[PDB]
Design a protein around this ligand. Structure first.
Ligand SMILES: N=C(N)NCC[C@@H]1NC(=O)Cc2cccc(c2)CNC(=O)CNC(=O)[C@H](NC(=N)N)CCCCNC(=O)[C@H](CCCCN)NC1=O
Lengths: 149, 38
């Protein structure tokens, strides 16, 4: 069913993802694009892109909401061993040769990778966990969003 | 064995804790999906 999920290996939490419209969405580095178990069921990788660091299971990428480039957002962080919590922030910007990407200066354990970032309507505007380490050792994550074809 | 477990509903929280700055960074993205500072 729709919601946010932990991704576990047997146990260790290696990441997080979003179930929406029957498709499971996570970051590629969480699963390395391998199949997942859900209860007694198997979720097979359907679409992915290592450069975007994204993968979807059971169908194509469904998350199409975009950061408006202006407003505060919320990370719905699901850290290992802790319940989901919402953290509001005003994104900064990754400026790249191919354009600007919103980025959040929020630092969580590696197994928080795949946690969704939300707009004020609760729509998922991207996933947390592909980023850079800045000079002082803190972290900035892109707001990584796929394309709904 | 890599498996998933439900962890909650996806809902914006009213009157939430606000933290973090808004850094403006020049970055590059390689073909393997790694970001780096320029
Ligand atoms: N081009 C490159 N490789 N950029 C890599 C960027 C970054 N990788 C790191 O932060 C590694 C790292 C670096 C220094 C120290 C530590 C970790 C120790 N910290 C922890 O052990 C928990 N915290 C941390 O690991 C990070 N915080 C911090 N202050 N270093 C926060 C991790 C958040 C989830 N994302 C990831 O794990 C990805 C995986 C890899 C995706 C690759 N495409 N990771 C990243 O983006």
């Amino acid at each position: 069913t729709d919601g946010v999920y932990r991704v576990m290996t047997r146990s260790t939490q290696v990441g997080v993802g979003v179930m929406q419209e029957g498709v499971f969405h996570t970051m590629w580095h969480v699963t390395k694009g391998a199949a997942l178990r859900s209860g007694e069921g198997r979720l097979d990788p359907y679409w992915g892109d290592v450069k975007q660091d994204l993968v979807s299971y059971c169908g194509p990428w469904k998350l199409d909401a975009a950061w408006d480039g202006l407003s505060e957002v919320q990370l719905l962080a699901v850290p290992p061993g802790e319940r989901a919590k919402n953290i509001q922030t005003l994104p900064g910007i990754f400026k790249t040769k191919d354009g600007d990407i919103g980025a959040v200066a929020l630092d969580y354990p590696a197994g928080t990778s795949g946690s969704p970032i939300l707009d004020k309507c609760g729509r998922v505007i991207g996933l947390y966990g592909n980023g850079v380490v800045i000079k002082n050792g803190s972290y900035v994550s892109a707001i990584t969003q796929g394309k709904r074809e | 064995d890599m498996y998933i477990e439900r962890a909650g509903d996806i809902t914006w929280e009213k009157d939430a804790e606000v933290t973090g700055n808004s850094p403006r960074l020049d970055v590059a993205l390689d073909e393997s999906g790694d970001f780096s500072l320029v």
